[PDB]
Amino acid sequence: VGFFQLFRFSSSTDIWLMFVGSLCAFLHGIAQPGVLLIFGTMTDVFIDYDVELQELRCGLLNIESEMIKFASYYAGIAVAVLITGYIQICFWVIAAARQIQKMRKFYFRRIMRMEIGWFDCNSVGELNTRFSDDINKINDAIADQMALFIQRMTSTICGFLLGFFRGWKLTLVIISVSPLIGIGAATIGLSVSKFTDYELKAYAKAGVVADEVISSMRTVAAFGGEKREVERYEKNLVFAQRWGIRKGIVMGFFTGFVWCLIFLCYALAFWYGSTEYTPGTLVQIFLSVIVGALNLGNASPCLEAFATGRAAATSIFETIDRKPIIDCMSEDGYKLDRIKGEIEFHNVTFHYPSRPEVKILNDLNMVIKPGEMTALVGPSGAGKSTALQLIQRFYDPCEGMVTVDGHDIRSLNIQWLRDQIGIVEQEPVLFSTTIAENIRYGREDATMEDIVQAAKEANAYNFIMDLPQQFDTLVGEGGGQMSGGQKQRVAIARALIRNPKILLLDMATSALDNESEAMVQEVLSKIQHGHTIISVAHRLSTVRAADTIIGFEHGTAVERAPVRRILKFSAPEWPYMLVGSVGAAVNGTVTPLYAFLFSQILGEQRSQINGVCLLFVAMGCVSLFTQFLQGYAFAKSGELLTKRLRKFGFRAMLGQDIAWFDDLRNSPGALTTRLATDASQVQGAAGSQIGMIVNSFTNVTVAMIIAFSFSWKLSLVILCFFPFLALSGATQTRMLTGFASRDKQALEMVGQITNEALSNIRTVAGIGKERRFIEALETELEKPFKTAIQKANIYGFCFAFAQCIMFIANSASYRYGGYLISNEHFSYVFRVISAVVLSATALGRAFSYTPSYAKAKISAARFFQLLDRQPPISVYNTAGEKWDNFQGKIDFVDCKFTYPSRPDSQVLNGLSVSISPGQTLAFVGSSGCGKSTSIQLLERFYDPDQGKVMIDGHDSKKVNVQFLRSNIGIVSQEPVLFACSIMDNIKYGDNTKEIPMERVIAAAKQAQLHDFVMSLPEKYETNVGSQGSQLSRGEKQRIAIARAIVRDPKILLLDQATSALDTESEKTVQVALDKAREGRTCIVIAHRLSTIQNADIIAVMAQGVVIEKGTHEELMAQKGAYYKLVTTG
Ligand SMILES: Nc1ncnc2c1ncn2[C@@H]1O[C@H](COP(=O)(O)OP(=O)(O)OP(=O)(O)O)[C@@H](O)[C@H]1O
Ligand SMILES: Nc1ncnc2c1ncn2[C@@H]1O[C@H](COP(=O)(O)OP(=O)(O)OP(=O)(O)O)[C@@H](O)[C@H]1O
Ligand SMILES: [Mg+2]
Ligand SMILES: [Mg+2]
């Protein structure tokens, strides 16, 4: 993008701030040539004073009056430089902050406004990484590097034109060589922009990997994939590291080339242009050479910033200006009144944008009557959810048209249309907030009476009146801190609160027991009179009350100490730090050495020109290598340090226990932005900042050494001032840390909000609350704005104070030197001491690196607190009992457990069941009785408070976690997947070693998956999408079963393994699962009692304790709770 398109979000006030700050930066830049002029005048008057002393009109001119005059001039320029520096830094920072805030708001608005298929083709980790890092880089490009670049540019141009205005026919060569510098700068800018593009692509890939791995923590722990994920992260880390070192190399070459050219150019100029000049003119010429070279060399980080900003803004602008095909927030359309509910299909044909080669809907024709219940039935993959989504205008038909009461869906207002549809998805998804808030997302004006009535109708009221925080308990993120049936009932309430006209049910009772199913069916039967209900069913029991049934057959419808820690951590990069330190030490020493040698050389017949030219060429020659060395070494050290930080952080994050991830302050959004941003913040201080610091320190040290080498009374007076500089630096660091302390909480919260919004676009679109999430993001973003406007003042004032106290020190030195001259050859001593102290004037800019220092401090502190934690269940711990012959005998003895997130609610009350090896147990009961909790305890995701579980006579709390986990096969209530092929998803079962193709094929065959995957254009290579969301839920359950089976585990865990695949007209998957459970210990929990018919032992669990136990015949004969559960349906 164009460099001046980065300001496309500016308003009039922003333009005013930029103009005023730029004027102040121009004055600050021209401050230094005034210093050159006064030094030249002082030299002239010094020689004019000592000529008459050499002699002995004359006697009329003294020294003290002019010395006080010079001191007053240095006081005036110091006041001016303080004012101008403060204004420039402050104003540029405000302008940048306002622009960045506006662009972030616009980016999120445009992303939310997009259509569903675009989200199918784009990963949420990509967008999160962009929103976190690329806009930050854009901000870094235009914040204050812009002002510093302007100041250095005006200082260099004025140092050049000093020779033109004062002096003549000596600056003929800078005009000759400037275009070469221009082309060099342009080419290096293009190169580093390309390298930046590659670097951000690599970091975006790494961000996607981290997001998926962190959001799939239970699965990645169950199947032991930590090593695979750390390697997967490290690959992208290595790629980005290579691009970063290339950037450092090219930049270091640019800086060294600039220095060497400049010095070589002026050496040749002094060689030939000599063929009149007072010594003061020579003095100011030599020092103008240095000011030009130094500021030109120091401008390079600004060029880095601008090119990185353009490269980063490319993709952000491309996303921001895209026009979506289907706009959920557009006004255009029609809003009819008095809808009846008749919806028809007309020869509809559809293919997903992700798989365009598959015809999923093929010439469909169905009619849905008003005020009736119509049930859709068919096998898995028959395109029922596709029609369900096409009704909502999630997509558009390729051919054909679906009408609502005789009107094309495309011709109606999308907001009004979607505000009349009540949807329950196959897997209800809740947002991390209270229960009443989650239910109220259906209708914002819903009162507490409305919420409680919706909960009562949804058969959810009792289980939330049995909670400690009734209606105010946090459901957790994604509703994870909830049971499946409870989550489903909350979703039913959220759907029914709106009182919709088109009520839509996608397996509305999948995770419900028969009693709650009966209650919900009674409510639906009461409601059925008015609204038109469309529900997909797999069982005839719910079909009993449906008026018409439509069958789907493959797309056709037929009716009926952080600093010390960092220093120790960065030990491996010691040689690069050593070489960079040596190079920057030489670079610091060369300047005062030049001042001394030049001042010596001046005080013109023989060999003086040869000496001058030889010195110039030697300095250019040395400076090229040393500047290159400094830049390259420090860039390499920073890159390696950040790579190691990211790798170790991801490893430590993966090594934590499941209760740590259940913390409400440990969300994947927060952890992802933490991992993405802490390393970058540390980089911003561990890069070339250290090289600049050591360069400046070596400069000041050498300058003071050779100042004290001549007269100690003036050098002491000069050294008297530096405590003020140290105090200013410390104060800035203190306030910066104070602000960053809460800046990081604000950043984590905005990251959590944006990830929760992006990851569940389908749910947010279904309920239609697009505005609420954008408003919440803006509200959470408004918090750091005040902090930013407050830190701008601190930064500007500290920078200005340092630069001002330097000139104060110079004026005081002039006054005291005048006193020493008048009171007590001292003119020569003062000349050389002033020369070196002026050559040592620009080293005090140690406040450019300070604003990043506090960020690095806080980030490193938090990183080490995360790194040094000891989990209660350490999966990286190699200590624990192991026995060679495993048998899979499991028994609970008086197991009790309470969730750490809900300490006032005990879930398990003395669980005690036993299983002999080779037997299966069926856990039956109501929803939320702790059935999945026992499985979590078995998988050592948690540990019982009192009581214990024994595996083959070994207490579970002393057996190795990896060893135990290798012997278990688990399927979850809501299985999850990774965004890769079906093949790799199956291969994930055994992560220790590769498994042959034959085993995968066999597992797929026994999982009833081979035919469907054979039907795909890519057989076993098709991408499944993020979380495996680009498949119907039946095939997700089937791939989960295949992945569990492929391990051949001694313990097999089945949690509602037939929830989605429920077509019971054929006895095939039942035989498949029976053969799977053959010959091994299995625990199978299922709310449908026909599939657990043949279990050896059936345990009925109520309120965390087992109340019945036996086989099917004894439990049936006892007429207990099992008889009522069976006979109720
Ligand atoms: N986003 C997507 N990208 C590609 N293919 C998809 C996507 N969503 C669904 N499909 C495919 O569409 C077909 C039917 O999906 P759909 O979810 O409508 O089936 P279904 O009859 O509702 O199944 P189930 O009974 O398992 O819920 C399947 O082949 C599935 O893989
Ligand atoms: N991570 C969690 N943190 C806190 N409470 C939880 C958590 N997971 C579940 N619960 C609660 O513990 C109780 C039992 O949960 P569990 O998931 O074990 O039930 P379940 O018997 O398997 O139910 P269902 O048949 O609905 O799946 C419920 O009240 C549920 O809301
Ligand atoms: Mg479905
Ligand atoms: Mg469960």
Residue numbers in the entry: 45 to 100, 128 to 346, 353 to 637, 739 to 781, 790 to 1010, 1013 to 1317
From the paper:
BSEP (ABCB11) is an ATP-binding cassette transporter that is expressed in hepatocytes and extrudes bile salts into the canaliculi of the liver. BSEP dysfunction, caused by mutations or induced by drugs, is frequently associated with severe cholestatic liver disease.
Human wild-type BSEP and a variant in which the catalytic glutamate of NBS2 was replaced by a glutamine (E1244Q) were expressed in HEK293 stable cell lines and purified in detergent. No ATPase activity was observed for BSEPE1244Q in detergent or in proteoliposomes, even at elevated concentrations of ATP and TC. Approximately 60% of the particles adopted a closed state and yielded a cryo-EM density map at a resolution of 3.0 Å. We observed tightly packed TMDs and NBDs in a closed conformation. We observed two distinct EM densities in the two NBSs, each corresponding to an ATP molecule, which is consistent with the characteristic architecture of other ABC transporters. ATP binding is mediated by the Walker-A motif interacting with the phosphate groups and the A-loop interacting with the purine ring of ATP through π–π stacking. BSEPE1244Q represents a state prior to ATP hydrolysis, whereas vanadate-trapped BSEP represents a state immediately after ATP hydrolysis.
